[PDB]
Design a protein around this motif. Structure first.
Motif, PDB file in Angstrom:
ATOM      1  N   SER A  76      12.115 -16.049 -20.289  1.00  0.00           N
ATOM      2  CA  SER A  76      10.879 -15.428 -19.368  1.00  0.00           C
ATOM      3  C   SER A  76      10.892 -14.019 -18.962  1.00  0.00           C
ATOM      4  O   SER A  76       9.739 -13.694 -18.438  1.00  0.00           O
ATOM      5  CB  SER A  76      10.463 -16.498 -18.315  1.00  0.00           C
ATOM      6  OG  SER A  76       9.385 -16.490 -17.403  1.00  0.00           O
ATOM      7  N   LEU A 108       9.481 -21.052 -25.291  1.00  0.00           N
ATOM      8  CA  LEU A 108       9.492 -21.232 -23.881  1.00  0.00           C
ATOM      9  C   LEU A 108       8.640 -22.358 -23.369  1.00  0.00           C
ATOM     10  O   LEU A 108       9.047 -23.310 -22.870  1.00  0.00           O
ATOM     11  CB  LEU A 108       8.858 -20.090 -23.208  1.00  0.00           C
ATOM     12  CG  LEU A 108       9.006 -20.112 -21.740  1.00  0.00           C
ATOM     13  CD1 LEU A 108      10.314 -20.565 -21.099  1.00  0.00           C
ATOM     14  CD2 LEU A 108       8.391 -18.551 -21.205  1.00  0.00           C
ATOM     15  N   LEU A 163       4.183 -17.780 -19.684  1.00  0.00           N
ATOM     16  CA  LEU A 163       4.211 -17.154 -18.595  1.00  0.00           C
ATOM     17  C   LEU A 163       3.666 -17.869 -17.337  1.00  0.00           C
ATOM     18  O   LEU A 163       4.117 -17.966 -16.189  1.00  0.00           O
ATOM     19  CB  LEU A 163       4.139 -15.856 -18.418  1.00  0.00           C
ATOM     20  CG  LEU A 163       4.945 -14.819 -19.484  1.00  0.00           C
ATOM     21  CD1 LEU A 163       4.886 -13.477 -19.270  1.00  0.00           C
ATOM     22  CD2 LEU A 163       6.420 -15.287 -19.272  1.00  0.00           C
ATOM     23  N   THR A 176       8.405 -10.926 -20.610  1.00  0.00           N
ATOM     24  CA  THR A 176       7.877 -10.413 -19.573  1.00  0.00           C
ATOM     25  C   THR A 176       7.978  -8.778 -19.547  1.00  0.00           C
ATOM     26  O   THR A 176       7.091  -8.029 -19.235  1.00  0.00           O
ATOM     27  CB  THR A 176       8.575 -10.634 -17.819  1.00  0.00           C
ATOM     28  OG1 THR A 176       7.969 -11.772 -17.410  1.00  0.00           O
ATOM     29  CG2 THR A 176       8.408  -9.721 -17.092  1.00  0.00           C
ATOM     30  N   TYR A 213       5.114 -20.958 -16.826  1.00  0.00           N
ATOM     31  CA  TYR A 213       6.554 -20.785 -16.354  1.00  0.00           C
ATOM     32  C   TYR A 213       6.464 -20.857 -14.892  1.00  0.00           C
ATOM     33  O   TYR A 213       6.894 -21.309 -14.083  1.00  0.00           O
ATOM     34  CB  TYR A 213       7.110 -19.546 -16.986  1.00  0.00           C
ATOM     35  CG  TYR A 213       8.444 -19.039 -16.047  1.00  0.00           C
ATOM     36  CD1 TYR A 213       9.803 -19.835 -16.545  1.00  0.00           C
ATOM     37  CD2 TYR A 213       8.401 -18.336 -15.118  1.00  0.00           C
ATOM     38  CE1 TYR A 213      10.726 -19.343 -16.041  1.00  0.00           C
ATOM     39  CE2 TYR A 213       9.539 -17.802 -14.464  1.00  0.00           C
ATOM     40  CZ  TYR A 213      10.832 -18.330 -14.889  1.00  0.00           C
ATOM     41  OH  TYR A 213      11.908 -17.879 -14.292  1.00  0.00           O
TER      42      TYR A 213
END
Length: 302
Positions: A267, A250, A293, A271, A296
């Motif tokens: 993502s 990611l 995250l 999560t 992101y």
């Protein structure tokens, strides 16, 4: 997930290895709440507590620092290249708010450069006792995982180098990151790397602006391993290894393309992994996942 992340705010204690096991995720959790702007949803004193924790870890970890700027579980124990790189990356970021003599970090970066080989790879003469804190690195692609890990660490260390005084070192560190990325690019091309080695390598190349051709081969070599099973993308309820590997992929995508389909598909998968009772399950997967995250988020809330 406010409270769940704030739960990662813990007090550092133990030897040099145990201290980072507490500091790393504490700093990661704090950074996550600092970037997602979710501090307000928590008691106002929580930030003072988090900030106070990060500071205590900074000092405590320095008690395990050798004269040459290297680290180990104990001062009498031989230094670990991985642990030293891990400390450098964390402290470099912790600089974001706690302040620290940049010279200390420039010295640590110098020590790391002595651990680099002629072929560009890095070796760890004396690995850490608690190998579980190293994550997916422990395996058959250890040399590659270590070289990629250390490269990322050096990159973060540069951002904390004093202006002008250490011009020569800077260049020696860039020259070091170049040989390693060369080594990594060659390995990614051969296609013999595992999922975790592929992900960390891709991120390492992208993050350090390696030659386009190299970054391109690492990206393609990675995507080919992608697992889009449902409207979920992932690499590798899910074992820590997969969470760590997917989180690295990611950070890569977000720096390689930005916020496309895969960025969101992945993502959403991690999560759900971090939502489970207890969140992520270990040092590496937890730290890297939170960094992913949080990075992101910014990309999705510009």
């Amino acid at each position: 997930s406010p409270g769940g992340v704030a739960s990662l705010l813990r007090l550092p204690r133990g030897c040099g290895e145990q201290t980072m096991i507490y500091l790393a995720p504490t700093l990661a959790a704090s950074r996550y709440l600092d970037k997602t702007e979710q501090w307000s949803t928590l008691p106002p004193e929580t930030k003072d507590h988090a900030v106070d924790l990060i500071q205590k870890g900074y000092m405590r970890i320095q008690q395990f620092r050798k004269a040459d700027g290297s680290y180990a579980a104990w001062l009498s124990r031989d230094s670990s290249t991985w642990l030293t790189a891990f400390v450098l990356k964390v402290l470099s970021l912790a600089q974001e708010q706690v302040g620290g003599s940049p010279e200390k970090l420039q010295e640590t970066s110098n020590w790391l450069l002595s651990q680099q080989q002629a072929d560009g790879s890095f070796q760890d003469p004396c690995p850490v006792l608690d190998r579980s804190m190293q994550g997916g690195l422990v395996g058959n692609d250890e040399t590659v995982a270590l070289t990629a890990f250390v490269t990322i660490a050096l990159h973060h260390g540069l951002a904390v180098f004093q202006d002008e005084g250490a011009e020569p070192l800077k260049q020696r560190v860039e020259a070091s990151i170049s040989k390693a990325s060369s080594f990594l690019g060659e390995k990614a091309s051969a296609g013999l790397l595992g999922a975790h080695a592929a992900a960390i390598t891709a991120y390492a190349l992208t993050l350090t602006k390696a030659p386009a051709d190299l970054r391109g081969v690492a990206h393609n070599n990675l995507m080919a391993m992608a697992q889009e099973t449902g409207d979920n993308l992932y690499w590798g309820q899910a074992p820590a290894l997969w969470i760590e590997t997917t989180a690295y992929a990611l950070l890569h995508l977000l720096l390689h393309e930005g916020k496309a389909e895969m960025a969101d598909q992945a993502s959403a998968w991690l999560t759900r992994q971090g939502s489970f009772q207890g969140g992520f399950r270990s040092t590496q997967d937890t730290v890297i996942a939170l960094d992913a995250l949080s990075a992101y988020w910014i990309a999705s809330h510009t």
